[PDB]
Amino acid sequence: EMTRLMVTEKQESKNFSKMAKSQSFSTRIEELGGSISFLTETGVTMIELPKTVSEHDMDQLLHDILAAGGVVGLDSEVKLA
């Protein structure tokens, strides 16, 4: 299970592009139950994260997104709930 955030990398959040690609963010949610999805056609990064992660991993890792300027949009909560 995993809630997918559609992040967009552009002059706004292009700081996020390589953040998600970083060794830290490559793994962070993947080991929790979610993962990364890059849609490089337009510059979107869909982060799937289950609310079954620890609140730290939920809040602060989806916030790691925002730390990178990455903007979070709700694709779907826990694999399309």
N, CA, C and O atoms as a DFTB+ gen file, in Angstrom:
324 C
 N C O
     1  1       0.849      -1.207       0.000
     2  2       0.000       0.000       0.000
     3  2       0.875       1.244       0.000
     4  3       2.008       1.198       0.479
     5  1       0.364       2.371      -0.536
     6  2       1.169       3.601      -0.631
     7  2       0.439       4.763      -1.314
     8  3      -0.078       4.630      -2.423
     9  1       0.415       5.897      -0.622
    10  2      -0.191       7.135      -1.106
    11  2       0.733       7.848      -2.074
    12  3       1.867       8.179      -1.729
    13  1       0.255       8.081      -3.275
    14  2       1.091       8.625      -4.322
    15  2       0.951      10.141      -4.403
    16  3      -0.138      10.660      -4.652
    17  1       2.056      10.844      -4.192
    18  2       2.082      12.292      -4.350
    19  2       2.690      12.637      -5.694
    20  3       3.813      12.231      -5.993
    21  1       1.962      13.377      -6.502
    22  2       2.478      13.811      -7.785
    23  2       3.247      15.120      -7.634
    24  3       2.667      16.205      -7.592
    25  1       4.556      14.983      -7.554
    26  2       5.454      16.112      -7.426
    27  2       5.862      16.592      -8.813
    28  3       6.060      15.771      -9.709
    29  1       5.993      17.892      -9.011
    30  2       6.434      18.393     -10.305
    31  2       7.720      19.199     -10.211
    32  3       7.833      20.130      -9.414
    33  1       8.681      18.824     -11.034
    34  2       9.971      19.477     -11.069
    35  2      10.037      20.473     -12.216
    36  3      10.024      20.099     -13.389
    37  1      10.106      21.738     -11.857
    38  2      10.241      22.822     -12.818
    39  2      10.927      23.985     -12.125
    40  3      11.423      23.810     -11.011
    41  1      10.978      25.164     -12.731
    42  2      11.687      26.298     -12.118
    43  2      11.231      26.543     -10.672
    44  3      11.926      27.194      -9.891
    45  1      10.062      26.015     -10.338
    46  2       9.564      26.003      -8.973
    47  2      10.308      24.974      -8.113
    48  3      10.946      25.327      -7.121
    49  1      10.218      23.704      -8.504
    50  2      10.664      22.609      -7.651
    51  2      11.761      21.765      -8.302
    52  3      11.949      20.609      -7.923
    53  1      12.483      22.317      -9.268
    54  2      13.572      21.581      -9.903
    55  2      14.644      21.151      -8.902
    56  3      15.471      20.291      -9.202
    57  1      14.625      21.748      -7.720
    58  2      15.521      21.349      -6.640
    59  2      15.187      19.938      -6.172
    60  3      16.040      19.226      -5.641
    61  1      13.938      19.549      -6.378
    62  2      13.455      18.249      -5.950
    63  2      13.925      17.141      -6.882
    64  3      14.119      16.003      -6.454
    65  1      14.109      17.477      -8.157
    66  2      14.398      16.485      -9.191
    67  2      15.507      15.529      -8.757
    68  3      15.353      14.310      -8.832
    69  1      16.616      16.091      -8.306
    70  2      17.771      15.296      -7.924
    71  2      17.685      14.861      -6.462
    72  3      18.443      13.996      -6.024
    73  1      16.763      15.460      -5.710
    74  2      16.558      15.083      -4.315
    75  2      15.989      13.683      -4.257
    76  3      16.487      12.820      -3.534
    77  1      14.935      13.472      -5.032
    78  2      14.272      12.181      -5.094
    79  2      15.206      11.114      -5.648
    80  3      15.093       9.934      -5.315
    81  1      16.128      11.547      -6.494
    82  2      17.072      10.658      -7.135
    83  2      18.242      10.341      -6.221
    84  3      19.041       9.450      -6.507
    85  1      18.340      11.072      -5.124
    86  2      19.447      10.909      -4.205
    87  2      19.344       9.562      -3.507
    88  3      18.248       9.026      -3.340
    89  1      20.483       9.015      -3.101
    90  2      20.532       7.706      -2.456
    91  2      19.606       7.656      -1.241
    92  3      18.998       6.626      -0.953
    93  1      19.509       8.777      -0.539
    94  2      18.653       8.881       0.629
    95  2      17.183       8.741       0.239
    96  3      16.461       7.927       0.815
    97  1      16.743       9.531      -0.733
    98  2      15.341       9.526      -1.107
    99  2      15.006       8.351      -2.021
   100  3      13.840       7.970      -2.125
   101  1      15.993       7.777      -2.677
   102  2      15.744       6.586      -3.479
   103  2      15.155       5.476      -2.610
   104  3      14.263       4.744      -3.037
   105  1      15.664       5.366      -1.396
   106  2      15.350       4.266      -0.522
   107  2      14.220       4.573       0.477
   108  3      13.387       3.713       0.767
   109  1      14.206       5.801       0.995
   110  2      13.446       6.165       2.207
   111  2      12.049       5.515       2.304
   112  3      11.727       4.907       3.325
   113  1      11.231       5.636       1.265
   114  2       9.872       5.134       1.319
   115  2       9.799       3.702       0.808
   116  3       8.985       2.904       1.273
   117  1      10.661       3.387      -0.156
   118  2      10.726       2.056      -0.749
   119  2      10.859       0.961       0.311
   120  3      10.331      -0.138       0.138
   121  1      11.559       1.258       1.401
   122  2      11.743       0.276       2.465
   123  2      10.598       0.339       3.467
   124  3      10.490      -0.505       4.356
   125  1       9.751       1.343       3.314
   126  2       8.621       1.530       4.204
   127  2       7.353       0.939       3.609
   128  3       6.403       0.631       4.329
   129  1       7.344       0.784       2.299
   130  2       6.195       0.209       1.640
   131  2       5.832       0.935       0.359
   132  3       5.131       0.391      -0.494
   133  1       6.309       2.168       0.225
   134  2       6.019       2.953      -0.963
   135  2       7.200       2.980      -1.924
   136  3       7.987       2.035      -1.956
   137  1       7.338       4.062      -2.719
   138  2       8.443       4.179      -3.675
   139  2       8.361       5.460      -4.516
   140  3       7.462       6.281      -4.339
   141  1       9.319       5.607      -5.432
   142  2       9.367       6.743      -6.356
   143  2       8.846       6.328      -7.738
   144  3       9.032       5.188      -8.161
   145  1       8.198       7.257      -8.429
   146  2       7.864       7.084      -9.837
   147  2       8.181       8.356     -10.604
   148  3       7.524       9.378     -10.408
   149  1       9.175       8.306     -11.470
   150  2       9.521       9.468     -12.266
   151  2       8.806       9.444     -13.600
   152  3       8.893       8.473     -14.352
   153  1       8.103      10.517     -13.882
   154  2       7.435      10.697     -15.151
   155  2       8.134      11.842     -15.877
   156  3       7.628      12.962     -15.935
   157  1       9.306      11.536     -16.429
   158  2      10.223      12.552     -16.935
   159  2       9.706      13.230     -18.204
   160  3      10.305      14.191     -18.688
   161  1       8.595      12.726     -18.738
   162  2       7.959      13.329     -19.907
   163  2       7.629      14.794     -19.657
   164  3       7.794      15.641     -20.534
   165  1       7.162      15.076     -18.454
   166  2       6.710      16.404     -18.102
   167  2       7.508      16.946     -16.915
   168  3       7.531      18.152     -16.669
   169  1       8.157      16.046     -16.188
   170  2       8.904      16.452     -15.015
   171  2       8.131      16.205     -13.745
   172  3       8.149      17.029     -12.831
   173  1       7.450      15.073     -13.678
   174  2       6.672      14.734     -12.505
   175  2       7.317      13.575     -11.751
   176  3       7.816      12.630     -12.362
   177  1       7.305      13.652     -10.436
   178  2       7.752      12.563      -9.594
   179  2       6.623      12.111      -8.666
   180  3       6.266      12.819      -7.724
   181  1       6.069      10.942      -8.934
   182  2       5.013      10.398      -8.093
   183  2       5.602       9.592      -6.936
   184  3       6.123       8.496      -7.144
   185  1       5.523      10.129      -5.726
   186  2       5.989       9.404      -4.548
   187  2       4.850       8.673      -3.883
   188  3       3.926       9.290      -3.353
   189  1       4.917       7.370      -3.910
   190  2       3.954       6.560      -3.214
   191  2       4.451       6.273      -1.802
   192  3       5.547       5.741      -1.626
   193  1       3.657       6.621      -0.800
   194  2       3.998       6.357       0.593
   195  2       2.777       5.906       1.369
   196  3       1.764       6.605       1.396
   197  1       2.861       4.743       2.000
   198  2       1.765       4.196       2.776
   199  2       1.629       4.892       4.109
   200  3       2.629       5.260       4.725
   201  1       0.412       5.076       4.557
   202  2       0.187       5.722       5.832
   203  2       0.436       4.737       6.956
   204  3       0.202       5.023       8.130
   205  1       0.918       3.573       6.562
   206  2       1.342       2.561       7.495
   207  2       2.816       2.753       7.859
   208  3       3.333       2.081       8.751
   209  1       3.489       3.677       7.158
   210  2       4.826       4.104       7.564
   211  2       4.744       4.781       8.923
   212  3       3.667       5.197       9.351
   213  1       5.871       4.892       9.592
   214  2       5.934       5.665      10.811
   215  2       5.652       7.131      10.473
   216  3       6.065       7.609       9.416
   217  1       4.958       7.846      11.355
   218  2       4.565       9.234      11.089
   219  2       5.758      10.076      10.643
   220  3       5.621      10.971       9.809
   221  1       6.918       9.782      11.203
   222  2       8.161      10.439      10.809
   223  2       8.407      10.263       9.320
   224  3       8.690      11.225       8.606
   225  1       8.295       9.029       8.863
   226  2       8.537       8.703       7.469
   227  2       7.431       9.254       6.592
   228  3       7.658       9.566       5.423
   229  1       6.242       9.376       7.146
   230  2       5.127       9.923       6.397
   231  2       5.262      11.430       6.290
   232  3       5.330      11.978       5.190
   233  1       5.301      12.094       7.426
   234  2       5.335      13.545       7.453
   235  2       6.665      14.062       6.933
   236  3       6.710      14.812       5.959
   237  1       7.747      13.659       7.587
   238  2       9.060      14.243       7.337
   239  2       9.663      13.820       5.998
   240  3      10.480      14.553       5.441
   241  1       9.282      12.662       5.471
   242  2       9.806      12.245       4.175
   243  2       8.995      12.845       3.038
   244  3       9.557      13.211       2.006
   245  1       7.683      12.950       3.210
   246  2       6.874      13.706       2.254
   247  2       7.175      15.192       2.403
   248  3       6.853      16.000       1.532
   249  1       7.798      15.531       3.519
   250  2       8.250      16.889       3.775
   251  2       9.656      17.078       3.229
   252  3      10.067      18.199       2.929
   253  1      10.396      15.977       3.100
   254  2      11.721      16.007       2.473
   255  2      11.529      16.468       1.050
   256  3      12.370      17.145       0.457
   257  1      10.384      16.071       0.529
   258  2       9.896      16.533      -0.741
   259  2       9.843      18.056      -0.760
   260  3      10.436      18.702      -1.624
   261  1       9.125      18.617       0.206
   262  2       8.973      20.063       0.322
   263  2      10.292      20.742       0.670
   264  3      10.527      21.891       0.297
   265  1      11.147      20.023       1.386
   266  2      12.483      20.501       1.714
   267  2      13.257      20.794       0.440
   268  3      14.147      21.644       0.408
   269  1      12.895      20.069      -0.602
   270  2      13.544      20.170      -1.886
   271  2      12.746      21.071      -2.803
   272  3      13.067      21.227      -3.981
   273  1      11.705      21.660      -2.247
   274  2      10.836      22.512      -3.015
   275  2       9.788      21.711      -3.747
   276  3       8.894      22.262      -4.390
   277  1       9.911      20.394      -3.641
   278  2       8.991      19.486      -4.281
   279  2       7.577      19.672      -3.791
   280  3       7.322      19.679      -2.586
   281  1       6.659      19.821      -4.722
   282  2       5.271      20.066      -4.384
   283  2       4.477      18.774      -4.377
   284  3       4.623      17.940      -5.272
   285  1       3.639      18.610      -3.370
   286  2       2.927      17.360      -3.180
   287  2       1.465      17.465      -3.610
   288  3       0.699      18.260      -3.066
   289  1       1.095      16.652      -4.589
   290  2      -0.290      16.564      -5.003
   291  2      -0.824      15.161      -4.815
   292  3      -0.112      14.189      -5.065
   293  1      -2.062      15.041      -4.378
   294  2      -2.631      13.737      -4.068
   295  2      -3.065      13.007      -5.334
   296  3      -4.086      13.340      -5.936
   297  1      -2.280      12.011      -5.730
   298  2      -2.680      11.102      -6.797
   299  2      -3.781      10.219      -6.269
   300  3      -4.836      10.049      -6.880
   301  1      -3.493       9.663      -5.105
   302  2      -4.324       8.670      -4.467
   303  2      -3.707       8.274      -3.141
   304  3      -2.488       8.125      -3.047
   305  1      -4.524       8.102      -2.120
   306  2      -4.015       7.639      -0.849
   307  2      -3.982       6.122      -0.843
   308  3      -4.852       5.466      -1.416
   309  1      -2.957       5.567      -0.181
   310  2      -2.622       4.132      -0.214
   311  2      -3.153       3.415      -1.463
   312  3      -4.302       2.976      -1.511
   313  1      -2.275       3.314      -2.470
   314  2      -2.569       2.728      -3.786
   315  2      -4.033       2.828      -4.198
   316  3      -4.738       1.829      -4.334
   317  1      -4.460       4.071      -4.391
   318  2      -5.782       4.393      -4.918
   319  2      -6.889       3.873      -4.013
   320  3      -7.566       2.893      -4.320
   321  1      -7.050       4.559      -2.891
   322  2      -8.122       4.283      -1.954
   323  2      -9.258       5.271      -2.178
   324  3     -10.273       5.213      -1.484
